Structures are given as C-alpha cells and as structure tokens.
mmCIF file of C-alpha atoms in Angstrom:
data_model
loop_
_atom_site.group_PDB
_atom_site.id
_atom_site.type_symbol
_atom_site.label_atom_id
_atom_site.label_comp_id
_atom_site.label_asym_id
_atom_site.label_seq_id
_atom_site.Cartn_x
_atom_site.Cartn_y
_atom_site.Cartn_z
ATOM 1 C CA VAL A 1 -2.573 26.554 -6.825
ATOM 2 C CA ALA A 2 -4.871 29.036 -4.437
ATOM 3 C CA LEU A 3 -3.382 30.342 -0.643
ATOM 4 C CA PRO A 4 -4.990 32.536 1.639
ATOM 5 C CA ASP A 5 -2.716 35.441 2.565
ATOM 6 C CA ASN A 6 -2.185 34.314 5.590
ATOM 7 C CA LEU A 7 -0.590 31.222 4.744
ATOM 8 C CA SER A 8 2.923 32.682 6.734
ATOM 9 C CA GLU A 9 1.101 32.854 10.339
ATOM 10 C CA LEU A 10 -0.268 29.523 9.601
ATOM 11 C CA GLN A 11 2.802 27.236 9.144
ATOM 12 C CA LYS A 12 3.983 29.896 12.357
ATOM 13 C CA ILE A 13 1.582 28.134 14.520
ATOM 14 C CA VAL A 14 1.671 24.589 13.528
ATOM 15 C CA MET A 15 5.841 25.016 14.237
ATOM 16 C CA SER A 16 5.013 26.706 17.400
ATOM 17 C CA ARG A 17 2.755 23.604 18.522
ATOM 18 C CA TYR A 18 5.627 21.213 17.389
ATOM 19 C CA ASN A 19 8.008 22.637 19.116
ATOM 20 C CA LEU A 20 6.663 22.470 22.733
ATOM 21 C CA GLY A 21 6.638 18.711 22.419
ATOM 22 C CA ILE A 22 5.020 16.766 25.316
ATOM 23 C CA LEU A 23 4.272 19.337 28.288
ATOM 24 C CA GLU A 24 4.142 17.244 31.702
ATOM 25 C CA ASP A 25 0.681 18.718 32.459
ATOM 26 C CA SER A 26 -0.954 17.429 28.615
ATOM 27 C CA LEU A 27 -0.459 13.670 28.516
ATOM 28 C CA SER A 28 -3.761 13.981 29.882
ATOM 29 C CA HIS A 29 -7.375 11.878 29.873
ATOM 30 C CA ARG A 30 -10.231 14.341 28.155
ATOM 31 C CA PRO A 31 -13.401 11.637 27.576
ATOM 32 C CA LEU A 32 -15.518 12.113 24.294
ATOM 33 C CA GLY A 33 -19.121 11.642 24.932
ATOM 34 C CA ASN A 34 -21.471 12.697 22.982
ATOM 35 C CA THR A 35 -19.660 12.065 19.800
ATOM 36 C CA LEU A 36 -20.803 13.210 15.552
ATOM 37 C CA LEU A 37 -19.069 11.449 12.961
ATOM 38 C CA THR A 38 -19.528 11.620 9.691
ATOM 39 C CA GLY A 39 -17.187 8.994 7.430
ATOM 40 C CA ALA A 40 -20.151 5.777 8.000
ATOM 41 C CA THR A 41 -20.808 4.271 5.108
ATOM 42 C CA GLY A 42 -17.027 4.688 4.433
ATOM 43 C CA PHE A 43 -14.064 2.374 5.153
ATOM 44 C CA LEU A 44 -12.261 3.928 7.921
ATOM 45 C CA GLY A 45 -15.932 4.643 9.427
ATOM 46 C CA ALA A 46 -17.343 1.749 10.374
ATOM 47 C CA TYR A 47 -13.853 0.922 12.365
ATOM 48 C CA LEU A 48 -14.105 4.229 13.703
ATOM 49 C CA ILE A 49 -17.986 3.226 14.894
ATOM 50 C CA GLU A 50 -15.856 -0.356 16.446
ATOM 51 C CA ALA A 51 -13.207 0.951 17.878
ATOM 52 C CA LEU A 52 -14.237 4.375 20.059
ATOM 53 C CA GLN A 53 -16.953 1.378 21.653
ATOM 54 C CA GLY A 54 -16.842 2.110 25.450
ATOM 55 C CA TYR A 55 -15.094 5.583 25.196
ATOM 56 C CA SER A 56 -18.235 7.413 23.762
ATOM 57 C CA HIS A 57 -22.249 8.381 25.824
ATOM 58 C CA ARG A 58 -23.594 7.487 22.617
ATOM 59 C CA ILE A 59 -21.998 8.214 18.629
ATOM 60 C CA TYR A 60 -24.180 10.553 16.120
ATOM 61 C CA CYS A 61 -23.602 9.708 12.597
ATOM 62 C CA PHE A 62 -24.117 12.148 10.227
ATOM 63 C CA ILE A 63 -25.431 10.609 6.950
ATOM 64 C CA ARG A 64 -26.059 12.260 3.646
ATOM 65 C CA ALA A 65 -29.600 10.495 2.752
ATOM 66 C CA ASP A 66 -32.671 10.740 1.420
ATOM 67 C CA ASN A 67 -34.838 9.571 5.547
ATOM 68 C CA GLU A 68 -34.199 7.955 8.259
ATOM 69 C CA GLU A 69 -35.306 4.671 7.025
ATOM 70 C CA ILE A 70 -31.893 4.839 4.173
ATOM 71 C CA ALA A 71 -29.621 6.334 6.484
ATOM 72 C CA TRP A 72 -29.985 3.472 8.360
ATOM 73 C CA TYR A 73 -30.209 1.144 5.798
ATOM 74 C CA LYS A 74 -26.798 2.379 4.279
ATOM 75 C CA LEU A 75 -25.095 2.573 7.704
ATOM 76 C CA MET A 76 -25.905 -0.458 9.140
ATOM 77 C CA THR A 77 -25.378 -2.615 5.796
ATOM 78 C CA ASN A 78 -22.247 -1.263 5.812
ATOM 79 C CA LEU A 79 -20.891 -2.706 9.338
ATOM 80 C CA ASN A 80 -22.355 -6.234 8.740
ATOM 81 C CA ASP A 81 -19.717 -6.444 6.346
ATOM 82 C CA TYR A 82 -16.486 -5.866 8.245
ATOM 83 C CA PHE A 83 -18.022 -7.712 11.209
ATOM 84 C CA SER A 84 -20.653 -10.550 13.288
ATOM 85 C CA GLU A 85 -24.424 -9.700 13.587
ATOM 86 C CA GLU A 86 -23.765 -10.711 17.672
ATOM 87 C CA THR A 87 -20.993 -7.567 17.397
ATOM 88 C CA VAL A 88 -23.308 -5.106 15.426
ATOM 89 C CA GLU A 89 -26.321 -5.654 17.039
ATOM 90 C CA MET A 90 -24.784 -3.943 20.939
ATOM 91 C CA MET A 91 -22.529 -1.268 19.119
ATOM 92 C CA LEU A 92 -25.921 -0.505 18.241
ATOM 93 C CA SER A 93 -27.090 0.772 21.430
ATOM 94 C CA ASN A 94 -26.184 3.775 21.962
ATOM 95 C CA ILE A 95 -25.758 5.692 18.375
ATOM 96 C CA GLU A 96 -27.580 7.663 16.112
ATOM 97 C CA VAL A 97 -28.379 8.796 13.052
ATOM 98 C CA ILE A 98 -29.040 12.187 11.413
ATOM 99 C CA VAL A 99 -30.094 11.946 7.954
ATOM 100 C CA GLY A 100 -28.641 15.216 6.394
ATOM 101 C CA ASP A 101 -30.021 16.567 3.056
ATOM 102 C CA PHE A 102 -26.905 15.897 -0.002
ATOM 103 C CA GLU A 103 -28.431 19.132 -1.492
ATOM 104 C CA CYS A 104 -27.433 21.443 1.733
ATOM 105 C CA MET A 105 -25.520 20.853 4.336
ATOM 106 C CA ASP A 106 -27.344 24.158 6.696
ATOM 107 C CA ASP A 107 -29.708 25.093 8.829
ATOM 108 C CA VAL A 108 -28.642 21.213 10.664
ATOM 109 C CA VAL A 109 -30.277 20.787 13.787
ATOM 110 C CA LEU A 110 -28.500 18.876 16.186
ATOM 111 C CA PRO A 111 -30.127 16.601 20.114
ATOM 112 C CA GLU A 112 -27.544 18.040 22.380
ATOM 113 C CA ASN A 113 -24.275 19.446 22.762
ATOM 114 C CA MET A 114 -21.366 17.663 19.934
ATOM 115 C CA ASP A 115 -18.154 17.734 22.642
ATOM 116 C CA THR A 116 -16.250 15.183 19.878
ATOM 117 C CA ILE A 117 -16.494 16.483 15.568
ATOM 118 C CA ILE A 118 -14.745 13.907 13.459
ATOM 119 C CA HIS A 119 -14.485 14.454 9.717
ATOM 120 C CA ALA A 120 -13.756 10.804 7.858
ATOM 121 C CA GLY A 121 -16.295 12.845 5.194
ATOM 122 C CA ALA A 122 -16.654 10.008 2.302
ATOM 123 C CA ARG A 123 -18.064 12.163 -1.026
ATOM 124 C CA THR A 124 -19.483 10.544 -4.238
ATOM 125 C CA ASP A 125 -17.027 10.551 -6.646
ATOM 126 C CA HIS A 126 -19.419 8.301 -8.889
ATOM 127 C CA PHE A 127 -21.541 11.614 -9.273
ATOM 128 C CA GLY A 128 -20.263 13.229 -12.442
ATOM 129 C CA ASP A 129 -17.301 16.573 -12.473
ATOM 130 C CA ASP A 130 -15.392 19.288 -13.504
ATOM 131 C CA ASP A 131 -13.201 20.064 -10.484
ATOM 132 C CA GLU A 132 -16.335 20.842 -8.674
ATOM 133 C CA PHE A 133 -17.623 17.668 -6.577
ATOM 134 C CA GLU A 134 -14.324 19.208 -4.770
ATOM 135 C CA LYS A 135 -14.991 22.486 -4.162
ATOM 136 C CA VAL A 136 -18.276 21.055 -2.316
ATOM 137 C CA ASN A 137 -15.902 18.749 -0.228
ATOM 138 C CA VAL A 138 -13.865 21.675 1.068
ATOM 139 C CA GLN A 139 -17.579 23.890 2.006
ATOM 140 C CA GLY A 140 -18.393 20.347 3.206
ATOM 141 C CA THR A 141 -15.616 20.508 5.726
ATOM 142 C CA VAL A 142 -16.353 24.209 6.342
ATOM 143 C CA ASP A 143 -19.441 23.234 7.084
ATOM 144 C CA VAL A 144 -18.308 21.252 9.904
ATOM 145 C CA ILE A 145 -16.188 23.387 11.343
ATOM 146 C CA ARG A 146 -18.732 26.623 11.819
ATOM 147 C CA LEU A 147 -20.808 23.853 13.488
ATOM 148 C CA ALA A 148 -17.874 22.733 15.750
ATOM 149 C CA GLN A 149 -17.977 25.918 16.855
ATOM 150 C CA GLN A 150 -21.398 26.811 17.270
ATOM 151 C CA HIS A 151 -20.979 24.395 19.881
ATOM 152 C CA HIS A 152 -17.478 24.589 21.613
ATOM 153 C CA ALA A 153 -16.308 21.087 20.032
ATOM 154 C CA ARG A 154 -13.166 19.493 19.454
ATOM 155 C CA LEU A 155 -12.523 18.563 15.655
ATOM 156 C CA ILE A 156 -10.491 15.808 15.253
ATOM 157 C CA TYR A 157 -10.098 16.107 10.529
ATOM 158 C CA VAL A 158 -8.742 12.920 9.711
ATOM 159 C CA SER A 159 -6.576 14.105 6.566
ATOM 160 C CA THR A 160 -4.006 11.839 3.596
ATOM 161 C CA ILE A 161 -0.502 11.900 4.758
ATOM 162 C CA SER A 162 -0.520 11.619 0.024
ATOM 163 C CA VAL A 163 -1.763 15.427 1.051
ATOM 164 C CA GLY A 164 2.822 16.503 0.793
ATOM 165 C CA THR A 165 3.993 12.875 -0.853
ATOM 166 C CA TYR A 166 4.414 14.165 -4.459
ATOM 167 C CA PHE A 167 6.856 16.422 -5.077
ATOM 168 C CA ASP A 168 8.541 17.951 -8.668
ATOM 169 C CA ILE A 169 11.957 16.386 -9.838
ATOM 170 C CA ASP A 170 14.729 18.542 -8.322
ATOM 171 C CA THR A 171 13.821 20.369 -5.448
ATOM 172 C CA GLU A 172 16.347 20.491 -3.173
ATOM 173 C CA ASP A 173 14.290 19.451 0.158
ATOM 174 C CA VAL A 174 11.515 16.995 -0.220
ATOM 175 C CA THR A 175 10.973 16.027 3.572
ATOM 176 C CA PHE A 176 7.557 16.348 5.096
ATOM 177 C CA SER A 177 6.776 15.854 8.306
ATOM 178 C CA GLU A 178 3.372 16.739 11.478
ATOM 179 C CA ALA A 179 5.494 20.552 11.420
ATOM 180 C CA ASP A 180 4.454 21.156 7.841
ATOM 181 C CA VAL A 181 1.666 22.512 6.172
ATOM 182 C CA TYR A 182 2.862 24.289 2.432
ATOM 183 C CA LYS A 183 6.187 22.857 0.980
ATOM 184 C CA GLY A 184 5.655 23.216 -2.518
ATOM 185 C CA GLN A 185 4.618 20.040 -2.586
ATOM 186 C CA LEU A 186 2.566 18.921 -6.248
ATOM 187 C CA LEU A 187 -1.592 18.696 -5.485
ATOM 188 C CA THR A 188 -1.522 15.905 -7.827
ATOM 189 C CA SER A 189 -4.991 13.910 -7.830
ATOM 190 C CA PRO A 190 -8.150 16.234 -7.537
ATOM 191 C CA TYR A 191 -8.900 14.439 -3.872
ATOM 192 C CA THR A 192 -6.185 15.510 -2.956
ATOM 193 C CA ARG A 193 -6.360 18.801 -3.565
ATOM 194 C CA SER A 194 -9.508 18.892 -1.894
ATOM 195 C CA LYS A 195 -8.272 17.002 1.954
ATOM 196 C CA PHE A 196 -5.517 20.067 1.125
ATOM 197 C CA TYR A 197 -7.526 22.761 1.208
ATOM 198 C CA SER A 198 -9.732 21.815 4.472
ATOM 199 C CA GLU A 199 -6.171 21.054 5.743
ATOM 200 C CA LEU A 200 -6.864 24.573 5.583
ATOM 201 C CA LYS A 201 -9.652 25.665 6.228
ATOM 202 C CA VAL A 202 -9.083 23.584 9.851
ATOM 203 C CA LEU A 203 -6.115 25.336 10.073
ATOM 204 C CA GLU A 204 -7.569 29.125 9.871
ATOM 205 C CA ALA A 205 -9.650 28.197 12.276
ATOM 206 C CA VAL A 206 -8.313 26.708 15.121
ATOM 207 C CA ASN A 207 -6.099 29.719 15.420
ATOM 208 C CA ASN A 208 -9.506 31.579 16.079
ATOM 209 C CA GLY A 209 -9.374 30.005 19.135
ATOM 210 C CA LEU A 210 -11.486 26.671 17.590
ATOM 211 C CA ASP A 211 -9.803 23.677 19.441
ATOM 212 C CA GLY A 212 -9.004 21.525 16.261
ATOM 213 C CA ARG A 213 -6.670 18.563 14.827
ATOM 214 C CA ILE A 214 -5.188 17.287 11.450
ATOM 215 C CA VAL A 215 -4.295 13.164 11.252
ATOM 216 C CA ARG A 216 -2.840 12.701 8.421
ATOM 217 C CA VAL A 217 -3.891 8.752 7.655
ATOM 218 C CA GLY A 218 -1.577 5.926 4.873
ATOM 219 C CA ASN A 219 -2.954 4.239 2.656
ATOM 220 C CA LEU A 220 -5.489 2.050 4.436
ATOM 221 C CA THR A 221 -6.233 -1.945 4.683
ATOM 222 C CA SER A 222 -7.585 -4.682 5.241
ATOM 223 C CA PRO A 223 -7.344 -4.811 9.407
ATOM 224 C CA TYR A 224 -4.937 -6.814 11.562
ATOM 225 C CA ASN A 225 -6.904 -8.847 12.968
ATOM 226 C CA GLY A 226 -10.669 -8.438 11.122
ATOM 227 C CA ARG A 227 -12.210 -9.668 8.143
ATOM 228 C CA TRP A 228 -10.070 -9.069 5.434
ATOM 229 C CA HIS A 229 -13.038 -7.582 3.436
ATOM 230 C CA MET A 230 -13.520 -4.132 1.973
ATOM 231 C CA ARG A 231 -15.999 -2.759 0.449
ATOM 232 C CA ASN A 232 -15.689 -1.198 -2.790
ATOM 233 C CA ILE A 233 -11.524 -2.791 -2.813
ATOM 234 C CA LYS A 234 -13.062 -2.757 -6.633
ATOM 235 C CA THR A 235 -11.726 0.523 -6.710
ATOM 236 C CA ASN A 236 -9.308 1.572 -4.174
ATOM 237 C CA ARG A 237 -5.871 2.590 -6.351
ATOM 238 C CA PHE A 238 -3.482 -0.111 -4.686
ATOM 239 C CA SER A 239 -5.299 -3.604 -3.885
ATOM 240 C CA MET A 240 -5.889 -3.529 -7.526
ATOM 241 C CA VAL A 241 -2.306 -2.451 -8.153
ATOM 242 C CA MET A 242 -1.123 -5.427 -6.694
ATOM 243 C CA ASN A 243 -2.652 -7.998 -8.019
ATOM 244 C CA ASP A 244 -1.491 -6.775 -11.456
ATOM 245 C CA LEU A 245 1.951 -7.386 -9.242
ATOM 246 C CA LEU A 246 1.555 -10.856 -7.851
ATOM 247 C CA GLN A 247 1.546 -12.557 -11.542
ATOM 248 C CA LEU A 248 5.088 -11.925 -12.514
ATOM 249 C CA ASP A 249 8.658 -12.928 -11.414
ATOM 250 C CA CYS A 250 10.225 -9.333 -12.485
ATOM 251 C CA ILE A 251 10.126 -5.960 -11.262
ATOM 252 C CA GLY A 252 11.480 -2.699 -12.500
ATOM 253 C CA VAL A 253 14.851 -0.223 -10.491
ATOM 254 C CA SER A 254 13.300 2.724 -10.031
ATOM 255 C CA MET A 255 9.268 0.340 -9.418
ATOM 256 C CA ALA A 256 10.291 -2.222 -6.828
ATOM 257 C CA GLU A 257 12.849 0.716 -5.423
ATOM 258 C CA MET A 258 9.764 2.606 -4.351
ATOM 259 C CA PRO A 259 8.098 2.031 -0.563
ATOM 260 C CA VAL A 260 4.505 0.203 0.929
ATOM 261 C CA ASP A 261 3.629 0.384 3.991
ATOM 262 C CA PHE A 262 0.161 -1.573 5.728
ATOM 263 C CA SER A 263 -1.446 0.899 8.500
ATOM 264 C CA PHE A 264 -4.367 -0.997 9.186
ATOM 265 C CA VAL A 265 -7.567 0.400 9.317
ATOM 266 C CA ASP A 266 -8.699 -1.085 13.016
ATOM 267 C CA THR A 267 -5.121 0.361 14.062
ATOM 268 C CA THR A 268 -5.913 3.389 12.535
ATOM 269 C CA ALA A 269 -9.168 3.671 13.886
ATOM 270 C CA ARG A 270 -7.904 2.801 17.595
ATOM 271 C CA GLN A 271 -5.027 5.344 17.383
ATOM 272 C CA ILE A 272 -6.992 8.287 16.033
ATOM 273 C CA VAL A 273 -9.670 7.328 18.789
ATOM 274 C CA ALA A 274 -6.460 7.328 21.458
ATOM 275 C CA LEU A 275 -5.576 10.932 20.503
ATOM 276 C CA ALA A 276 -8.827 12.589 20.446
ATOM 277 C CA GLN A 277 -8.712 11.455 24.122
ATOM 278 C CA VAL A 278 -5.374 13.094 25.209
ATOM 279 C CA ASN A 279 -5.318 17.289 24.783
ATOM 280 C CA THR A 280 -2.053 17.182 23.315
ATOM 281 C CA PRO A 281 -0.686 20.620 22.061
ATOM 282 C CA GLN A 282 0.375 19.520 18.212
ATOM 283 C CA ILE A 283 -1.832 19.977 15.149
ATOM 284 C CA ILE A 284 -1.434 17.735 12.893
ATOM 285 C CA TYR A 285 -0.691 14.493 13.537
ATOM 286 C CA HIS A 286 1.139 11.041 11.237
ATOM 287 C CA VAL A 287 -0.938 7.776 11.945
ATOM 288 C CA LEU A 288 1.034 5.728 9.734
ATOM 289 C CA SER A 289 2.508 2.118 9.827
ATOM 290 C CA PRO A 290 6.074 3.127 10.457
ATOM 291 C CA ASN A 291 7.148 -0.295 9.089
ATOM 292 C CA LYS A 292 7.873 0.821 5.598
ATOM 293 C CA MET A 293 9.307 -2.508 2.955
ATOM 294 C CA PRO A 294 10.145 -1.571 -0.259
ATOM 295 C CA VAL A 295 8.055 -3.744 -2.856
ATOM 296 C CA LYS A 296 10.972 -6.351 -2.876
ATOM 297 C CA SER A 297 11.621 -7.322 -0.088
ATOM 298 C CA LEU A 298 7.941 -8.053 -0.321
ATOM 299 C CA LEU A 299 7.490 -9.361 -3.335
ATOM 300 C CA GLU A 300 10.342 -11.972 -1.916
ATOM 301 C CA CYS A 301 7.884 -12.777 0.799
ATOM 302 C CA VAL A 302 5.268 -13.410 -1.234
ATOM 303 C CA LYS A 303 6.902 -15.781 -3.547
ATOM 304 C CA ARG A 304 9.229 -16.697 -1.041
ATOM 305 C CA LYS A 305 11.876 -16.588 -3.797
ATOM 306 C CA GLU A 306 13.572 -14.484 -5.304
ATOM 307 C CA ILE A 307 12.305 -11.468 -7.381
ATOM 308 C CA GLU A 308 14.913 -10.274 -10.307
ATOM 309 C CA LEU A 309 15.612 -6.654 -11.407
ATOM 310 C CA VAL A 310 14.574 -5.753 -15.195
ATOM 311 C CA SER A 311 14.690 -1.820 -16.573
ATOM 312 C CA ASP A 312 11.940 0.409 -17.082
ATOM 313 C CA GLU A 313 11.783 0.371 -20.563
ATOM 314 C CA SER A 314 12.128 -3.004 -20.496
ATOM 315 C CA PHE A 315 9.262 -3.211 -18.255
ATOM 316 C CA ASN A 316 7.110 -1.315 -20.546
ATOM 317 C CA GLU A 317 7.059 -3.804 -22.980
ATOM 318 C CA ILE A 318 6.180 -6.957 -20.493
ATOM 319 C CA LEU A 319 3.297 -4.345 -19.541
ATOM 320 C CA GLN A 320 1.378 -2.930 -22.230
ATOM 321 C CA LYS A 321 1.904 -7.437 -23.034
ATOM 322 C CA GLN A 322 -1.019 -8.073 -21.242
ATOM 323 C CA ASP A 323 -3.190 -4.952 -21.809
ATOM 324 C CA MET A 324 -1.814 -3.398 -17.870
ATOM 325 C CA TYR A 325 -3.917 -0.747 -18.413
ATOM 326 C CA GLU A 326 -4.860 1.929 -15.439
ATOM 327 C CA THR A 327 -2.518 -0.459 -13.090
ATOM 328 C CA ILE A 328 0.350 1.061 -15.604
ATOM 329 C CA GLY A 329 -0.498 4.705 -15.437
ATOM 330 C CA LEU A 330 -0.667 5.275 -11.842
ATOM 331 C CA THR A 331 2.203 3.617 -11.387
ATOM 332 C CA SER A 332 5.093 5.793 -13.688
ATOM 333 C CA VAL A 333 3.189 8.588 -12.779
ATOM 334 C CA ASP A 334 4.502 7.587 -9.198
ATOM 335 C CA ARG A 335 8.022 7.564 -10.731
ATOM 336 C CA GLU A 336 7.854 10.229 -13.249
ATOM 337 C CA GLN A 337 8.699 12.372 -10.071
ATOM 338 C CA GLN A 338 10.331 12.948 -6.629
ATOM 339 C CA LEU A 339 9.471 11.135 -2.964
ATOM 340 C CA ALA A 340 8.330 12.652 0.491
ATOM 341 C CA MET A 341 11.369 11.138 2.789
ATOM 342 C CA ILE A 342 7.990 11.171 4.665
ATOM 343 C CA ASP A 343 8.748 12.140 9.434
ATOM 344 C CA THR A 344 6.148 10.310 11.632
ATOM 345 C CA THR A 345 8.601 10.702 14.706
ATOM 346 C CA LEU A 346 6.295 13.328 16.789
ATOM 347 C CA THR A 347 3.657 11.303 16.437
ATOM 348 C CA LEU A 348 5.270 8.060 17.072
ATOM 349 C CA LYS A 349 6.463 8.917 20.729
ATOM 350 C CA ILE A 350 2.849 10.145 21.115
ATOM 351 C CA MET A 351 1.129 7.569 20.525
ATOM 352 C CA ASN A 352 3.139 4.786 22.085
ATOM 353 C CA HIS A 353 3.288 7.492 25.026
ATOM 354 C CA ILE A 354 0.290 6.627 25.585
ATOM 355 C CA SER A 355 -1.074 3.763 23.233
ATOM 356 C CA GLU A 356 0.357 0.809 21.881
ATOM 357 C CA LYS A 357 2.885 0.487 19.082
ATOM 358 C CA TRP A 358 1.761 -0.660 15.433
ATOM 359 C CA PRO A 359 1.457 -4.244 15.595
ATOM 360 C CA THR A 360 4.747 -6.460 13.465
ATOM 361 C CA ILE A 361 3.687 -7.366 9.651
ATOM 362 C CA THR A 362 3.900 -11.018 9.230
ATOM 363 C CA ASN A 363 5.153 -12.924 6.741
ATOM 364 C CA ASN A 364 1.988 -15.459 7.167
ATOM 365 C CA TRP A 365 -0.355 -12.705 6.690
ATOM 366 C CA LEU A 366 0.696 -10.988 3.918
ATOM 367 C CA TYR A 367 0.263 -14.474 2.307
ATOM 368 C CA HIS A 368 -3.115 -14.079 3.123
ATOM 369 C CA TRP A 369 -3.257 -11.248 2.258
ATOM 370 C CA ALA A 370 -2.097 -11.648 -0.806
ATOM 371 C CA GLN A 371 -4.883 -14.906 -1.540
ATOM 372 C CA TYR A 372 -7.077 -12.827 -1.123
ATOM 373 C CA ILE A 373 -6.341 -9.936 -3.439
ATOM 374 C CA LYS A 374 -6.020 -12.267 -5.973
ATOM 375 C CA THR A 375 -9.075 -14.212 -5.750
ATOM 376 C CA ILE A 376 -11.067 -11.058 -5.316
ATOM 377 C CA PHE A 377 -10.139 -9.886 -9.229
ATOM 378 C CA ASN A 378 -11.108 -13.380 -10.890
#
C-alpha cells in the first residue's frame, strides 16, 4: 500500500479544483487535432477511434507489435469486428500506426507535435507475472506522462471506478466522489492497484504544470447502438457471472441487493471525447451510467416474472450443485466487504451541460442483451 509522501498535497488540489465548479469562461471548445491513442486493440479503444472521428485531425495509434505490418493487422482486425467494412474504410483514411517495442517504452520517436494524448493502456495479461506485470503498467503510464510534458499536450488518462468501489467492513464513511483520491478503500485486484497508482502518477505530474485529467469509467458493456459483439467476452468478469445467473429462478439477499450498471461503450466513448474538448478546471471525472439498478429488478425484466429470495446459506448449496467455479468466488468476494456509494454528480452536470445524457435502457434491449450472453457461453 505505497502512497507518496506528498499525498496530502495531491488531495488538496483535486478538491481545490472540484470546488471550482464550472466557471463561466470554462465551457468553451479547444480542438484535439493530432491525438495519440494507446487503447486500440482493446474494447474502449476501438469505440474511441470511432467516437473522435471528425473531431480530430489525424489519430496516431501506438501499438506494441513486432513491426508495422503486424500492428496494422492487429488494429484492423479489431475494428472489423465492431463495425462494417464500409465504415472502417473511411475511419482508416486519417489514422496512422506507431509500432512500438514491447520490452522498452523508451526512445519513442514521434512524427508531429501531439496536442492530445488518451491512454487506455491494455497490458498483456496472458503472460505470467509475480504481480510484476502490474508495475510495468505504472511504468507504461509514467512513460506516457513523460511524453506528454515533452510535447506540451493535454493528457487524458482513462481509469476505472473500481479504483475505489470496494471498502473494508466496519468503516464509518464510505462515499466516493470525483473529489476523492485516497480514502482507505481496498485495492483488491492487481489490475485495480495499478490503475490506482497511475492515477497517482498522473496526479503528481498535473501538479507540476501539466494539463491532464482522469476519467474513471464504469463496467463497460455492449454499446447502445452497435454490434452486440465484444472481443474476449469469454474473459470479462461481469458478463460471465450474468450467464451463470440467468439459468436460475431464485437469488440471494446480499447477492441481489447489489447494483449493476450498463455503462455502454459507445456512450462512454462519446462522453470521453466531449470531455477532452472542453477545457474545464476539474481533474477527476466519473463517466458512468447513473441509471444503476438492483439485480432484482433486472431479472424481473428478463424473465418477466418475479424472482424470489433465498438466504445466502441456502444459496451456496444450489451454487456448488452446478459447479459454479469462478462466478461463485467473485460473487461472494463482493458480498464479503462493504460497497462504496459512488457520487457522480459534478461530472453529470458537465457531461450533460454540453453533451448528451445517458440513453434510457429499454426492456427489450436487455432481452436481446440477455440472449447474446446466453448464446455465447454455449
């Protein structure tokens, strides 16, 4: 749990800018132009290059791959899944690839002054690590920052709301807002602990003159309007827990009182792009579907019936009966502790003071969303 000696000064500035609200001069547009993205090859990355199509001069995608040929292939294959060949071609007109070495994130020679940098930062999770592939992530972040100052660019670092959504039991205050950096939340996973440390590394650099901001995204799901497909959905924690859950008709008490959001990818992408254009004093933003619902009223809309409650004890029985495996273990791992009350108000003002609000979920949409999750795991 290593926190900088000057954490006090960090928290002091995010709160300083938080209580600035929206200044009259603040709401105004600054163009992106030459943007450098890392996250293509990934989920949010692909929908990010579709969402800043037209607000940006040229998109320079930095991809770790052994040559230019392979990096293009890795990227095009990605986009080809989410969109039509017609819409991918035009997207492909104003965009270039920056083949980068996997071992070293050094000596990167870029061909123009990048005024905007968005870091989504997928890391090779399939390669073995002793929690050491999670320190090279922070290295992978601190290397982007170094390049951000060198160009005098606006850095946008995409983090996760999970960076402060889990709290220890028996803690008095548990709220988490765009003003909170560290509050004693527990960083369970090594992924979370890394997206946390980069948030800190981006913070202490924003103190030293750099223009940068952190966008905390929620659990990303298939877009509102787009293809339901999501690459590597087989390994996403959220979606696979839903399929193990949609074969039953009873649901736990502590289990089904839990919230579930549908932060659509295309909306998260659209919002992040709107956020990078308006200069606005805050440093941390929460881009998250505010339409959270309990799992109860979600299974009442997928089965059209009423699901009935059982105890957690009698649940564990019916769970092992079908070899629940990992879905059970991350289900009781969210029940064992306290769940942070996420404040998203200050961002909700802005991201609807200029952009769109979040699309209202519709009952048939989920039925379709249900069917996709059902079919893919069989």
